[PDB]
Amino acid sequence: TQSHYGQCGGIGYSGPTVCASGTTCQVLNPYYSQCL
């Protein structure tokens, strides 16, 4: 997964695309999707 307040998705992101089992994939901005 990715950590809390980490990146699950982005325009130019290159890491885990799954949020933590305590966090969820959500959008903060069209260039940064956060794990909440």
Ligand SMILES: *O[C@H]1O[C@H](CO)[C@@H](O)[C@H](O)[C@@H]1O
């Ligand atoms: O997926 C999230 O939890 C994992 C541990 O269960 C971590 O390895 C990962 O990087 C995320 O924090």
Ligand SMILES: *O[C@H]1O[C@H](CO)[C@@H](O)[C@H](O)[C@@H]1O
């Ligand atoms: O989840 C934590 O580690 C991640 C990298 O493995 C980061 O993307 C995240 O922001 C946290 O620091």
Ligand SMILES: *O[C@H]1O[C@H](CO)[C@@H](O)[C@H](O)[C@@H]1O
């Ligand atoms: O995720 C991939 O692109 C990123 C920059 O947009 C790099 O920082 C990363 O290491 C990967 O190459």
